[PDB]
Design an enzyme around this catalytic site. Sequence first.
Site, short mmCIF file in Angstrom:
data_model
loop_
_atom_site.label_atom_id
_atom_site.label_comp_id
_atom_site.label_asym_id
_atom_site.label_seq_id
_atom_site.Cartn_x
_atom_site.Cartn_y
_atom_site.Cartn_z
N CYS A 18 -6.43 -0.07 -1.06
CA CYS A 18 -5.84 1.26 -0.80
C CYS A 18 -5.71 2.04 -2.12
O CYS A 18 -5.08 1.55 -3.06
CB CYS A 18 -4.49 1.12 -0.10
N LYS A 76 0.36 -4.41 11.20
CA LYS A 76 1.53 -4.44 10.33
C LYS A 76 2.61 -5.39 10.82
O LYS A 76 2.75 -5.58 12.02
CB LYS A 76 2.13 -3.04 10.17
#
Lengths: 233, 224
Positions: A26, A53
């Site tokens: 990321c 997640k």
Amino acid sequence: RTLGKGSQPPGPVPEGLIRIYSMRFCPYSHRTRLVLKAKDIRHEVVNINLRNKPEWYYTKHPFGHIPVLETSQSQLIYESVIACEYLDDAYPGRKLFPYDPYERARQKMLLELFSKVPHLTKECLVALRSGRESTNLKAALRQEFSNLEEILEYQNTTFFGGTSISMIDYLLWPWFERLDVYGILDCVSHTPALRLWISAMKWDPTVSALLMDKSIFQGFLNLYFQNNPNAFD
Amino acid sequence: ATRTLGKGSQPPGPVPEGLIRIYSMRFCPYSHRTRLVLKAKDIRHEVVNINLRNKPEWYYTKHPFGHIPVLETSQSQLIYESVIACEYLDDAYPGRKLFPYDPYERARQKMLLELFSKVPHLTKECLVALRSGRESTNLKAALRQEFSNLEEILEYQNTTFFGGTSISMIDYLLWPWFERLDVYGILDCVSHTPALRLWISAMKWDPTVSALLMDKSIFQGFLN
Ligand SMILES: N[C@@H](CCC(=O)N[C@@H](CS)C(=O)NCC(=O)O)C(=O)O
Ligand SMILES: N[C@@H](CCC(=O)N[C@@H](CS)C(=O)NCC(=O)O)C(=O)O
Ligand SMILES: [Cl-]
Ligand SMILES: [Cl-]
């Protein structure tokens, strides 16, 4: 290892450490990881599986965005720009933002000028990997890079903040590192001062220490674009 | 409280030493924001109002797309837009500091600013809908939801203001759009948020807010 659905919460952050919630590829969390390393701040990284997640992660960020900083006093700071600012103000050694209040403001103005690049680079990647048209996306990206090139040429400095690397350079870097793997290094073929800046950044000890493994990154992108959940593990 | 510069006007001269200039428009909330900070810190400044519907040709040398607000210094430096300008002002000028000194508390105020980020556009859309006679139930519901997020913060903190027991930078950065709810006809969007209504009153009682408070009938008359 990246935590996801089913993983237990990590414990409280030890005294004398700060925690960053991140993900290995990321670019936003890469910003903040550069700032941590550049300032020699003692930290631990907790990587998060963005597709799957942990349910507890919504207690660190309400929409489960990364990066998030978590302190030993259980304080939460996000997202990347605010986190980087906090780090520079809260930790003493090597200040990354300039001393002059005007120059600090100018770096923030440069950051605004950069605001379309992250989404354009991502759309270019997705366009090239799906075989979709990319003429407009590359022309757009080239224009954004010409805006940056004008700044460097006008200033006649290697870096955006001056002769030495500073906060602004680290804030822009993740997306430039990615041009190679994304297949869009040709988008800086018209901007010579920017190409000099890329080289200068690569020689920076912090940048160099955090450089992605190209082959592993390509492997990540290959499973990501096949819609494979394992890409985020 | 002075006339606005449009197309065919002359460029202003250099900003004199000891002054800072702000390019504004009398009813622009983003400029209001920066003017609040100028006044709260007792900074000597001049306000130069710009005709946004018919911009001076020279104004594009101040902002490449003719946006406001812009600060212009005695050193010929240009600083924009509203948030960067507000921070610059608080850091560059001594005396009353509006951001907290503490790094975490300061970061938290910036996080609150981000939480607020949909409000400006939603308030404008609500105004445009109500004035043009278009649908507004869903726009109002969206605004009520953002205001519920703010209510939650005040209720959790149990303080009058967003940064604690006294007014600080964050409150001034939010205020312009709340001042406008009345004239916009959307005061009903805070009917479910009692701490937020208390905060509106606390803000109106602040000397800086009160000094810049638009006259309701004048503002009503502008929006025609
Ligand atoms: N504006 C934020 C953006 C951060 C962001 O979008 N991060 C990505 C990961 S690179 C994310 O949280 N995405 C998670 C998702 O899409 O589910 C910043 O500057 O940090
Ligand atoms: N993001 C800017 C927004 C400034 C802005 O959009 N101001 C309005 C006036 S209230 C404007 O410049 N509009 C005129 C235009 O778009 O040309 C800020 O934070 O100050
Ligand atoms: Cl290179
Ligand atoms: Cl009131």
